[PDB]
Write a protein that binds this ligand. Structure first.
Ligand code: CER
Ligand code: CER
Lengths: 411, 411
């Protein structure tokens, strides 16, 4: 039996450009939400997002190579490098073959698609960049990373909307467990804060519209929720087989011990009031890990600050935790960070891992007045200190009722 | 140990709207390539593609529901229904939970992205459809199918460019083998024959330009190759665990016995002249199945009719088959059908499965003059009759050097 452990972390996010900085900002209840200034938002109903601030990549990616790449790929690589550096792995010819990648995105290169389409509308097909395809398609984050580090193992990319993050980590472990790889770089990257991504979610009426107080917009479970808050970023994990990691003397952050997937079979964008799909994915993760709900100390919720969405997950937690529902800690870091779509599950896996390290649970800021029936401990305003927390659960749900959960364990 | 078998086939393609029709057209060496007429191609360097002809879906999808869906999703569903109908599975409340889906696409809804972006350019963000997001994102084929049949098992979507098809089948089996599901609907759907998809690949100089003879454009391994030929379509497979399938008395088409993944670590679009990545993926598939190259009767090649691409794969076959390289049959059905990108690996899995059933190997049409060093039996012009063929191998390679292979076995 092969046990997968997390030996390397890397990340870009709205509250920080590194893992540790981001983690301090979350624990200090800082927000990363801000007014969008890279495109005219006058006609838009949402004028704010969680944007990655003062991002440098020149040291890692050259200006000549920057032009073949949408910003989502740029983020993915930089965060991937971080994860590799943190891992300390040395890739040798005797190694290459056993190391792979499992990185996805919800929609990939929206920025460059809009740009190319604009050129085509204004100049015909001869003005379309020669890199249009490889600069936008979702799997190019893993493509460039494999090339960069000479990785020859398995190379997949799962694109399941907001569950992407969780699914890539899940299958990266599965791959390792199966024997196809020893080390896997996994995570997700997203950069949808573009006209079409902001407009598009606006069109569906899914985004918050609180432009008078951008940092208060995102309020999971609060009575005044009006929609999720969009955020860009990327979170990369290095997963590797225990023994392999043991022999090399690797920083072991945690052990990936459970992975559950489920389908809703209800609505294309809406979740069931019930939360049954969310319930069956936690449930399945539990079975896969072989533990009971009661051993879960902290649940990093999907909790996107949407009226219907937050209700459902809460209910699913009450179904799964039952009597231990009052003793379990459930927060949403999306109150600060915003929804990272394809990257959400990746960064939130890092937050659930660090919580094990530090026994501190990031808060759910802006939760001034819980709505009617939410009696759970949502870690309301300030980080909570804890003791003896062995496991944490991490949720992510997505359009098409595609659900996933990851269980982490302290080692 | 769990053995996965294929109990249901479904498919839309340029040469046919059903599985059997398509199969007859391939064996009769028919081409599906034609002049594009849904957009002005006057300024374009390629004016032809493999398009799905006279496609009906009204019986399956209503006109009110058609509007929330890009054509790639439309194709996926219709082909998925076919696969379910062919399977004969009955979904019950005692069943739902164990049946899932694993359907991907290379780029998903290009058609609707261009349309929405056009509206936004000409009318601002209020003219963007409310279904923009769910009508384009890659995972909505599995989303709608799960809802339609009430599937509650695992729901993933792999988006690895032209390897998508193979990867979704691969992981669908892995999932089943692992125990997360008993039945999985898997495959891919693509519909990139749009201005941006044709222009975009044109921009890279990757497409054939033989507009004077569209049906002769696609010529894998021929000396006059000038680029791949674009094709739309979808191919769906129903994978299910042997025992489960046995007990229900299911039509067993074949057994999925091997799945190999590999990374090139060379170039973002170009393959290595060597074909080493392609070699290591066949190699890995072989190990996973536990058989030797010599037992492989037919290889459905990636063979996209690209100068560099076709060279490399051929070499990789010579490395893997070695002495049996002359006795093994290698054809490319892309000579007729064109490249289905995200769907390519799905339809070609069906062609490798049917070849087992009928012991007939589809030809590589248009191969008038093999280039210099290609001495392999490429099944040059007419279908070849065979006897005692137990296994077939199926290849698919993609941008970012992401490789995959599937091995099928006659039962
Ligand atoms: C996210 C959610 N409901 O939690 C949802 O599944 C989703 O739409 C992700 C797909 C988005 C990809 C980025 C595209 C932006 C236009
Ligand atoms: C396909 C190949 N080289 O065999 C290649 O990997 C690829 O570009 C697939 C990605 C395309 C998705 C459809 C987008 C069209 C614009």
């Amino acid at each position: 039996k092969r046990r997968v452990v997390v030996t390397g972390l890397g990340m870009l996010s709205p509250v920080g450009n590194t893992v540790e900085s981001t983690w301090k900002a979350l624990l200090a209840g800082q927000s990363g939400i801000s007014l969008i200034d890279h495109f005219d938002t006058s006609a838009y109903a949402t004028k704010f997002a969680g944007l990655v601030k003062d991002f440098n990549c020149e040291d890692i990616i050259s200006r000549k190579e920057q032009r073949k790449m949408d910003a989502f790929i740029q983020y993915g690589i930089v965060a991937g490098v971080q994860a590799m550096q943190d891992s300390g792995l040395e890739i040798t010819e005797e190694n290459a073959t056993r190391i792979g990648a499992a990185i996805g995105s919800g929609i990939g290169g929206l920025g460059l698609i809009e740009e190319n389409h604009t050129s085509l509308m204004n100049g015909g097909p001869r003005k379309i960049s020669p890199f249009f395809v490889p600069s936008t398609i979702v799997n190019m984050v893993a493509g460039h990373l494999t090339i960069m580090y000479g990785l020859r193992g398995p190379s997949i990319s799962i694109a399941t909307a907001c569950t992407s993050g969780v699914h890539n980590i899940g299958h990266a472990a599965r791959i390792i467990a199966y024997g196809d790889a020893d080390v896997m770089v996994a995570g997700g990257a997203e950069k949808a804060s573009t006209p079409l991504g902001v407009g598009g979610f606006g069109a569906a009426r899914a985004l918050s519209t609180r432009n008078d107080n951008p940092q208060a917009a995102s309020r999971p479970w609060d009575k005044e929720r009006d929609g999720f808050v969009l955020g860009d970023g990327a979170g990369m994990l290095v997963l590797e087989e225990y023994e392999h990691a043991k022999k090399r003397g690797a920083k072991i952050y945690a052990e990936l011990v459970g992975f559950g997937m489920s389908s809703d079979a209800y609505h294309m964008t809406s979740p069931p009031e019930n939360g049954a799909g969310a319930a069956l994915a936690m449930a399945n993760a539990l079975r896969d890990a072989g533990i009971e709900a009661s051993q879960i100390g902290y649940v990093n919720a999907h909790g996107t600050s949407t009226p219907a969405g937050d209700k459902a997950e809460a209910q699913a937690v009450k179904t799964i935790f039952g009597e231990a529902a009052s003793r379990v800690l459930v927060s949403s870091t999306k109150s600060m960070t915003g929804h990272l779509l394809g990257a959400a599950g990746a960064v939130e896996s890092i937050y659930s891992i660090l919580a094990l390290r530090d026994q501190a649970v990031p808060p759910t800021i802006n939760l001034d007045n819980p709505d009617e029936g939410c009696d759970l401990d949502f870690v309301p305003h300030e980080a909570r200190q804890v003791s003896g927390m062995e496991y944490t659960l991490c949720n992510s749900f997505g359009f098409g009722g595609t659900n996933g959960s990851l269980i982490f364990k302290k080692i």
